[PDB]
Amino acid sequence: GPYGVSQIKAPALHSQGYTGSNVKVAVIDSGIDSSHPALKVAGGASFVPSETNPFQDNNSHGTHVAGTVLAVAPSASLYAVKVLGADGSGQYSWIINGIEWAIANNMDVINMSLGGPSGSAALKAAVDKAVASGVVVVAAAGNEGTSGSSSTVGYPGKYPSVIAVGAVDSSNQRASFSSVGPELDVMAPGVSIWSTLPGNKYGAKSGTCMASPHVAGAAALILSKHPNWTNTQVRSSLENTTTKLGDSFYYGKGLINVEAAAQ
Numbered sequence: 001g002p003y004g005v006s007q008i009k010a011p012a013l014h015s016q017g018y019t020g021s022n023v024k025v026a027v028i029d030s031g032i033d034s035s036h037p038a039l040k041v042a043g044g045a046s047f048v049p050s051e052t053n054p055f056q057d058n059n060s061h062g063t064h065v066a067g068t069v070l071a072v073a074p075s076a077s078l079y080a081v082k083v084l085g086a087d088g089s090g091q092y093s094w095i096i097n098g099i100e101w102a103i104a105n106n107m108d109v110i111n112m113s114l115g116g117p118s119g120s121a122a123l124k125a126a127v128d129k130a131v132a133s134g135v136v137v138v139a140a141a142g143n144e145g146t147s148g149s150s151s152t153v154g155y156p157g158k159y160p161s162v163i164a165v166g167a168v169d170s171s172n173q174r175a176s177f178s179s180v181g182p183e184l185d186v187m188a189p190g191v192s193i194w195s196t197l198p199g200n201k202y203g204a205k206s207g208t209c210m211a212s213p214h215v216a217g218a219a220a221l222i223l224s225k226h227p228n229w230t231n232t233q234v235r236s237s238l239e240n241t242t243t244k245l246g247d248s249f250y251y252g253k254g255l256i257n258v259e260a261a262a263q
Contacts, residue, residue: 002071003170004189008214009259010072013221018262020073020220022227026107027069027213028098029062029114030088031055032080033198039066044080045101047094051085057198058086064205065113065213067196072217072258073224079107084114092120099126103133108223111216112139112162113209115154115179124159131161136219136231140190140208141166141252142179151181157208158183163219163235166252167191167211172243174250178208184252185239188214218258225262237261 005011013019024042031048034041034055044054057063057080066078083098084090095114102110103126110130130137141164142154157164157179164183167175167190175191190211192204215238222234229237241260245251 002194004193004214005071007170007189008072008218008256010221012259013262018221018225020076020224023073023076023109023220023223024079024107025069025076025109025111025216025220026079026081026102027062027066028081028083028095028102028110028112029065030059030084031057031062031082032066032078033057033063034080036063036196036198036200038196039070040078041080042077044082046082047097048082048085048090051082054080054082059084059088060197061088061113061209063198064195065111065209068193068210068213069111069217071195072214073220076220092123096122096126099130103130103135107135109136109216109219110138111213112156113212115140115142115157117154119155119158123156127156127159127161131231134231136234137161138163138165138212138216138219140212141184143177143207144179145177146180151183152179153181153183154179163215165208165212165215167208168255172245172255174246175206180250182249184248186215186242186252187211187245187255215256218256218261221258222262237263
């Protein structure tokens with residue numbers, strides 16, 4: 001539908017009947033507005049102390065990311081894992097509570113369109129465990145841009161177990177804001193991404209947070225075709241079938257091509 005879906009080659013899978021059905025996707029974000037007619041939410045949970053309903057998105061971020069997931073994998077079972085409050089901020093403990101929940105609740109795919117500048121042993125443990133537990137863990141690389149020769153990939157994106165997604169525009173050009181570094185895995189569209197907003201609205205947002213769900217969505221599609229594939233297999237297929245862009249420090253492996261990754 002949106003340009004970014006066609007750019008990742010998603011509609012080729014849709015046309016074959018691969019739409020991410022029976023795939024459990026965890027959007028660990030600001031919740032998802034379950035009242036949106038374009039959205040279907042299967043479940044979830046809130047870990048934000050003062051915002052108990054995961055189905056209420058007081059920010060818009062979670063709804064918008066959710067919408068991008070569903071746009072790529074329309075049949076995926078979306079779970080609102082509410083870890084960010086209305087301000088789009090969340091404490092690490094809520095974020096890790098939400099990854100813990102995602103593992104316990106047998107989420108196939110974790111999308112984290114969130115990043116912090118520092119890690120924790122608890123953050124790496126939770127990410128590691130989900131991976132070890134067979135979950136495809138997808139996070140935005142960050143919106144840090146370039147910083148001399150240093151890595152600007154945030155956490156959890158910086159951990160080897162996490163797929164760190166950078167943003168490209170529609171021209172396959174890296175977005176100036178896209179965090180860079182050796183931990184960058186893949187690129188997805190992330191500039192002016194049109195998606196669902198709370199209250200039956202649509203709007204565009206830019207950010208690696210936007211590129212992340214296209215990869216989560218892509219992971220769901222792959223799993224819908226090859227349910228037998230391990231998270232490691234989905235990972236390798238997405239990184240090895242990329243359209244090669246510039247240097248890996250700026251583009252990772254390049255742009256995801258789900259049609260190529262799905263074999």
